[PDB]
Write a protein that binds this ligand. Structure first.
Ligand SMILES: Nc1nc2c(ncn2[C@@H]2O[C@H](COP(=O)(O)OP(=O)(O)OP(=O)(O)O)[C@@H](O)[C@H]2O)c(=O)[nH]1
Ligand SMILES: Nc1nc2c(ncn2[C@@H]2O[C@H](COP(=O)(O)OP(=O)(O)OP(=O)(O)O)[C@@H](O)[C@H]2O)c(=O)[nH]1
Lengths: 427, 438, 185, 178
């Protein structure tokens, strides 16, 4: 059948995937030990998209976990699910990263690529018919960037026929911590736009704003933020595993979503988010779900598209519904702002209907869109790169690694070409 | 794995290492016997010690630090002290002669016959250690003996091992207090010898430590005891990264890279805000806002350079204990908004964050308080070069009158060293203003 | 004894100006003496060991027979002044097989004797202040065909005028020697 | 054991490198103009040795002079023989795996080896003959390494090599004419 394989790269990718897999195991009711307790037939027979059976009825995750700092995955192991994660799957690294993109891009990976490729191709043989793979990391994440570049590069040629989903968290515009971070991000995004097909966009500042908005809980964990985001990605993956008349294929989505090859970046949206009073101060109807769903407040991805226009939008809606509600909702929103979209393509809304509702609540939905809301981001990165490349700060490290400024020139040039493309298409 | 090796060079370094290693054994709850209670922490050397101690199957921790001395009184005293069973006999490397503060004496006379010895020690530890991310050197610029010794050993470790990080720590010359007027001489010798190999140098000053002590520690008659406790608290905060885990884990290599923009100048400065008396903590409150404001307050730095005379390039905040990221980002955003703060236009981002869950515990017989949120704040700014201007207008007059250089000519060195070093330092100042200007 | 120390460099075991230099040197005095008296040529204090019989009186290392020496260096040099008398010395070592063996350098010796546990060598030399040089591996290789590994003890007999015994890995030249090693009259 | 104390005393100038989780090394004094006779089997005793960090030196240096020192093993072979069978009798899975790897590299290293090894099988083989079949992530299958050793051996060994290996090993098969 048709399956996908997970990759957790970088110190974020690891912890992200920890949250992800524990959540999925909860949803399908596998004990942390690994002995599933029969609750849901359909989930039992659909689980084979991601899990592989181990003797006694044990369903091993098909995720490849990579990093260089032992403590990260060791802490994850100390978590309540490393026992279901396999010692075979764990690959360790012979370096402290230094958060150096060039180091993680030319020297350290030079001797790991072989082994990691062999492990993932063993996994590919383990699976039978793939759609592709998905990855989780950060664009600014040094190890994740420096390695994901090479690994995705290779996987592209060995399998030019499969979808390489990229789920890289986007850092704060107002703080970057790392000062060479814009350099690393631009480096990454060059080959990112060059290879990738799907790119996600998620931002910590937006998460904090939402926490203060509706979570209202004062002090969360970044793990609670991951709670939210892994809930979103679980929602987008609900389609493949579930019955109900919706079309699940990520390619079925992407063909609709991408008018042109230079369109890669996509902005999620998540359905009902509730606070202490609101659990009993709110009801569950498609109009209010859609209203909240299409709110710059409920927006969490990059930044407000209020400055721009929407190009493509696609949402999935989970629970027991009918067609007429979403029909009237899309017609409504279409009429309420026939302005804020583009003439170029009318009727840019794509929807899916999943029957099997989530555990804990009845009605849910997810939404992913392409609008002109990345221009601020990459204009910012342009001005940052120029501002610290006018005098070439911190350059001695990357020269010691053995790189040259022409790489930076061409990369920023490609980024500016994408700037012009996004600008021109909408205006 | 994740460990490093420390060198404690100097009479000056023995007190500080002694107090520090006391503190480490203390937070780890290490019995002065050399072994643990019935609790299970001993083995082959894989647990919180494993970076610092090497507790073999015999069950005895082996700290990964070499203490070198030339005046045997102090080293024999500590040899007769409490933790001597812990301390390996000849790891306490001792010499029987003294350099009389002279850099040339300690750099040519004694070092040659002892550098092979310390090399043997360090290689015979390097074999057994696993990851060895770097080296933690406790020294001083005006080394009453450590100056030339440290310079030569730094030369040799650089030439043989140009791959790993090197971390240097020194009590900086007091701008207005000096026991010796040849301290500028030998200190600038050390600096000019270091710059072309020195990886990351951090300085501290005792006067401001005194000032803090009677500012908010309520001590008017201080001792090396409190001095060492606080400097060791700083280094303990920095080593807690290796010790425990946290929200994010950062590294000395990250600090090296991201703290310095351009070569040569690799001399940032520390700052620890939450020092306060126990009763003051008992009837007052701590939070990220005020501690950030304090660590940004001009009179909260161990070096007396005015930030309104300086300009900010690099900063690094490390929290230890229980905090959240919301107030972190909010406070740093407020700082960036604050106009009195003056960063360079080069770096719209100029900071490095680190977070650790583990609460800072308390040493019995200390003088600190019971903290719940701690931070180390490491910054490089432009206000530094005034110190070197001070030192150069000090040095040039005493060199024109060349007072007591006859000692140096007797020990056999010449003036070309001073010749080169003066314009080397001058090149350093000129670097400083050309980077300060945009 | 002090194995932890570094065989690298030079090993002065006994050196005359030491205030109390006799710790690890068990003394067996019989019809003789130990004296500490200046010379005329070096006009510096040196050791004097004499006795009526030389087998009766002898110094040795280590002091504890229940302890070894533990030395790798195969080269030995002694600073002796000939006194026109009957002197000898002894060294015992452990080898490639792990069987013990002794070397017996005796000034009187009229012949050369090889016994399965000990070799003998005559000593004849000039007068005044002169020097001793020997290579453990050399002699063991030549006589027993085995391979020198380490030293375990050393004994010295009477009729001798003593400045310093020291050990070295190799045949050292005359210029790297320190000034106190650079003997002058 | 003896080699561990020999180096704990110290006569080998070997350097190193190291990082988070992996492997690398260096050295201080080159080997070719030092020795391949007075130190080769003494260092090989580290193979029979099993203790951090000494096994690092053993496992790697054993390869190292193998790549760097071809035309000298010729006379040292009987001295090499001993620690091999000592480690074989030591009877540890990990140790014998390391052996099998390094011995594989030994045989393939250079020429003349099997023909000179002619007198020297009846001591190394039979313990392996009984190790045949008690049992690719990191090359862990004892039996697979065993058959690899026999395969790499026999063809290079010569003509009656296989028949004597057979006399050791009643399962043993030809890799030549079957
Ligand atoms: N799960 C998790 N991730 C975080 C958190 N805070 C920050 N991150 C980010 O996740 C990013 C990506 O991690 P990695 O891809 O492993 O980065 P790296 O290559 O190891 O190098 P660095 O980015 O310096 O860590 C880091 O750079 C952090 O900035 C957090 O609290 N939880
Ligand atoms: N680190 C440290 N500094 C000290 C100590 N006591 C005083 N100081 C200050 O640091 C300097 C100590 O350096 P030196 O006097 O050169 O020390 P030394 O070279 O190793 O030799 P000594 O004369 O035995 O101290 C002094 O000038 C003091 O200003 C101490 O115990 N430790």
């Amino acid at each position: 059948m048709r399956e996908i394989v997970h990759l957790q790269a970088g110190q974020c990718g690891n912890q992200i995937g920890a949250k992800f897999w524990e959540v999925i195991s909860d949803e399908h009711g596998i004990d942390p030990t690994g002995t599933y307790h029969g609750d849901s037939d359909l989930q039992l027979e659909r689980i084979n998209v991601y899990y592989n059976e181990a003797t006694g009825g044990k369903y091993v995750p098909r995720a490849v976990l990579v990093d260089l700092e032992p403590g990260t995955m060791d802490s994850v192991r100390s978590g309540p699910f490393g026992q279901i994660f396999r010692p075979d799957n764990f690959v360790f690294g012979q370096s402290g990263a230094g958060n150096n993109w060039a180091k993680g891009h030319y020297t350290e990976g030079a001797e790991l690529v072989d082994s990691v490729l062999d492990v993932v191709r063993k996994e590919a043989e383990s699976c039978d018919c793939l759609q592709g793979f998905q990855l989780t990391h950060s664009l600014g994440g040094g190890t994740g960037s420096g390695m994901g570049t090479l690994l995705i590069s290779k996987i592209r040629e060995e399998y030019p026929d499969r979808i390489m989903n990229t789920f890289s968290v986007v850092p704060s515009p107002k703080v970057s911590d790392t000062v060479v971070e814009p350099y690393n991000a631009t480096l990454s995004v060059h080959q990112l736009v060059e290879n990738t097909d799907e790119t996600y966009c998620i931002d910590n500042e937006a998460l904090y704003d939402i926490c203060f908005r509706t979570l209202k809980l004062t002090t969360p964990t970044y793990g609670d933020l991951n709670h939210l985001v892994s809930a979103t990605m679980s929602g987008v993956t609900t389609c493949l595993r579930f019955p109900g008349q919706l079309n699940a294929d990520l390619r079925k989505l992407a063909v609709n979503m991408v008018p042109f090859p230079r369109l890669h970046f996509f902005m999620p949206g998540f359905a009902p988010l509730t606070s202490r009073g609101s659990q009993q101060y709110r009801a569950l109807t498609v109009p209010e779900l859609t209203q909240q769903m299409f709110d710059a407040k409920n927006m969490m991805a990059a930044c407000d598209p209020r400055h721009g226009r929407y190009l493509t939008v696609a949402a999935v809606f989970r629970g027991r519904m009918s067609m007429k509600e979403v029909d009237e909702q899309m017609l409504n929103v279409q009429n309420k702002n026939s302005s804020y979209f583009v003439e170029w393509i009318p009727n840019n809304v794509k929807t899916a209907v999943c029957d099997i509702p989530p555990r804990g609540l009845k009605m849910s939905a997810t939404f992913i869109g392409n609008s002109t809301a990345i221009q601020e981001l990459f204009k910012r990165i342009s001005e940052q790169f120029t501002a610290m490349f006018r005098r070439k700060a911190f350059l001695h490290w990357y020269t010691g690694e053995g790189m040259d400024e022409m790489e930076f020139t061409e990369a920023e040039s490609n980024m500016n070409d994408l700037v012009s493309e996004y600008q021109q298409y909408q205006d | 794995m994740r460990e490093c090796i420390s060198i404690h060079v100097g009479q000056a370094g023995v007190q500080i290492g002694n107090a520090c290693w006391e503190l480490y054994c203390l937070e780890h709850g290490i019995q002065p016997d050399g072994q643990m209670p019935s609790d299970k922490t001993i083995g082959g050397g894989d647990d919180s010690f494993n970076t610092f101690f090497s507790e073999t199957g015999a069950g005895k921790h082996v700290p990964r630090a070499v203490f070198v001395d030339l005046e045997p009184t102090v080293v024999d005293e500590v040899r007769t002290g409490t933790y001597r069973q812990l301390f390996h006999p000849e790891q306490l490397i001792t010499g029987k002669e003294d350099a009389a503060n002279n850099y040339a004496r300690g750099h040519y006379t004694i070092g040659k016959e002892i550098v092979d010895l310390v090399l043997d020690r360090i290689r015979k530890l390097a074999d057994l250690c696993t990851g060895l991310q770097g080296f933690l050197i406790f020294h001083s610029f005006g080394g009453g003996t450590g100056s030339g010794f440290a310079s030569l050993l730094m030369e040799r470790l650089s030439v043989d091992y140009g791959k790993k990080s090197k971390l240097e720590f020194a009590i900086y010359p007091a701008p207005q207090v000096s026991t010796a007027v040849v301290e500028p001489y030998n200190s600038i010798l050390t600096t000019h010898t270091t710059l072309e190999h020195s990886d990351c140098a951090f300085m501290v000053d005792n006067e401001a430590i005194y000032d803090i002590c009677r500012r908010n520690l309520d001590i008017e008659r201080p001792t090396y005891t409190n001095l060492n406790r606080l400097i060791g608290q700083i280094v303990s905060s920095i080593t807690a990264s290796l010790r425990f885990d946290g929200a994010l884990n950062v590294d000395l290599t990250e600090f090296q890279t991201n703290l310095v923009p351009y070569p040569r100048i690799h001399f940032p400065l520390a700052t620890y805000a939450p020092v306060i008396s126990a009763e003051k903590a008992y009837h007052e409150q701590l939070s990220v806002a005020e501690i950030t404001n304090a660590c940004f307050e001009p009179a909260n730095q161990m070096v007396k350079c005015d930030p309104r005379h300086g300009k900010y390039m690099a900063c690094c905040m490390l929290y230890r204990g229980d905090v959240v990221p919301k107030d972190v980002n909010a406070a740093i955003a407020t700082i960036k908004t604050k106009r009195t703060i003056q960063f360079v236009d080069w770096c719209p981002t100029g900071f490095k964050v680190g977070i650790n869950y583990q609460p800072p515990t308390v040493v019995p017989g200390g003088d600190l308080a019971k903290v719940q949120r701690a931070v180390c704040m490491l910054s490089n700014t432009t206000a530094i070069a005034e110190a070197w201007a001070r030192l150069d207008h000090k040095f040039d007059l005493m060199y024109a009158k060349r007072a007591f250089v006859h000692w140096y000519v007797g020990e056999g060195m010449e003036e070309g060293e001073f010749s080169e070093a003066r314009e080397d330092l001058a090149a350093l100042e000129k670097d400083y203003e050309e980077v300060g200007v945009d | 004894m002090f194995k932890n120390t570094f065989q690298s460099g030079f090993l002065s075991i006994l050196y005359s100006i030491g205030s109390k230099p006799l710790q690890i040197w068990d003394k067996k005095v019989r019809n003789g003496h130990i004296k500490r008296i200046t010379d005329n040529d070096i006009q510096s204090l040196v050791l004097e060991i004499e006795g009526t019989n030389v087998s009766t009186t002898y110094i040795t290392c280590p002091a504890d027979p229940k302890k070894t020496l533990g030395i790798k260096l195969p080269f030995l040099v002694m600073i002796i002044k000939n006194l026109k008398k009957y002197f000898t010395f002894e060294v015992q070592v452990l080898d490639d097989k792990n069987v013990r063996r002794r070397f017996r350098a005796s000034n009187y010796q009229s012949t050369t004797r090889v016994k399965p546990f000990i070799c003998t060598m005559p000593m004849r030399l000039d007068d005044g202040w002169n020097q001793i040089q020997f290579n453990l591996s050399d002699f063991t290789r030549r006589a027993y065909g085995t391979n020198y590994i380490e030293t375990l003890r050393v004994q010295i007999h009477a009729n001798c005028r003593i400045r310093r015994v020291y050990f070295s890995d190799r045949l050292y030249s005359e210029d790297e020697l320190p000034a106190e090693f650079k003997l002058y009259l | 054991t003896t080699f561990r104390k020999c180096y704990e005393r110290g006569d080998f100038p070997i350097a190193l490198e190291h990082d988070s989780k992996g492997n690398k090394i260096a050295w201080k004094v080159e080997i070719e103009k030092l020795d391949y006779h007075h130190y080769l089997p003494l260092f090989f005793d580290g193979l029979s040795e099993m203790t951090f960090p000494y096994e690092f030196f053993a496992r790697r240096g054993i390869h190292d002079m193998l790549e760097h020192g071809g035309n000298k093993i010729l006379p040292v072979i009987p001295q090499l023989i001993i620690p091999i069978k000592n480690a074989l009798n030591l009877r540890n899975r990990q140790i014998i795996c390391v052996t099998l790897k390094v011995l594989q590299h030994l045989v393939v290293s250079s020429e003349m080896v099997g023909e000179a090894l002619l007198p020297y099988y009846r001591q190394i083989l039979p313990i392996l003959n009984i190790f045949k079949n008690m049992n690719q992530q990191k090359r862990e299958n004892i039996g697979d390494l065993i058959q690899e050793t026999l395969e790499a051996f026999e063809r290079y060994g010569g003509e009656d090599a296989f028949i004597n290996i057979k006399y050791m090993v009643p399962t043993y098969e030809s890799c030549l004419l079957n």
